[PDB]
């Protein structure tokens, strides 16, 4: 899929990422 929003996905997980 060449056409897919290549931006950042602002609604991501902003938490601490324990792993």
């Amino acid at each position, epitope marked *: 899929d060449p056409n897919a929003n290549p931006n950042v996905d602002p609604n991501a*997980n902003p*938490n*601490a*990422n*324990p*792993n």
Partner: antibody
Amino acid sequence: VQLVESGGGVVQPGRSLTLSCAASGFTFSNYGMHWVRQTPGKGLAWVAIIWYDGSKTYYEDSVKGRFTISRDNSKNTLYLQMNSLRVDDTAVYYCARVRHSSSRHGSAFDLWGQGTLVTVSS
Amino acid sequence: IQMTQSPSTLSASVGDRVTITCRASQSVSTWLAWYQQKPGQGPKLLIYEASSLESGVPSRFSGSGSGTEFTLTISSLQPDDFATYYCQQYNSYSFWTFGQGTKVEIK
């Protein structure tokens, strides 16, 4: 290399117990270490994690606020202060070392201790 | 993630081929490890990232899979390979959880 724990025994519910975990044969101040339970009749379960510096800790959802994991790099030890013990916490506790990994995602627990038995009963 | 291992207990003889299947309730990419725990000891790492082999393990142990279906394969069972095997996962944003553990017994 070797990794041996201590401090087990039997205590009454509600008492406080301190576990230790001495590491030898390698640079202990280089690895983030874990504590893992083993309740008979159930598989292993994770308990805490120490971030190679004492800066970051993450606990299991059932032991948050009753368990305190802390490490001393100078004497090559780990400590897991267990407060407000309950009958559920009867399990063998293991130390685990996180394998060196060439990424930002950690790795598995390679070096495991022989385990100490902690019994809580009346 | 809840990791369930099947079969719970499998019987095998020396030199027989053994396959253990581990499944995950959510996708864990390739982040998965296997452990061997002989009775009365501490478990020893065998496979990390579900494909690589930890240094010091014999070449008999192997593993493959990605996503939610993982398997461990022992090409030739040995008298020292009779122990309980565990399936651990470490996803990107999920904590470490272990499986029930399958015991390989002597036929």
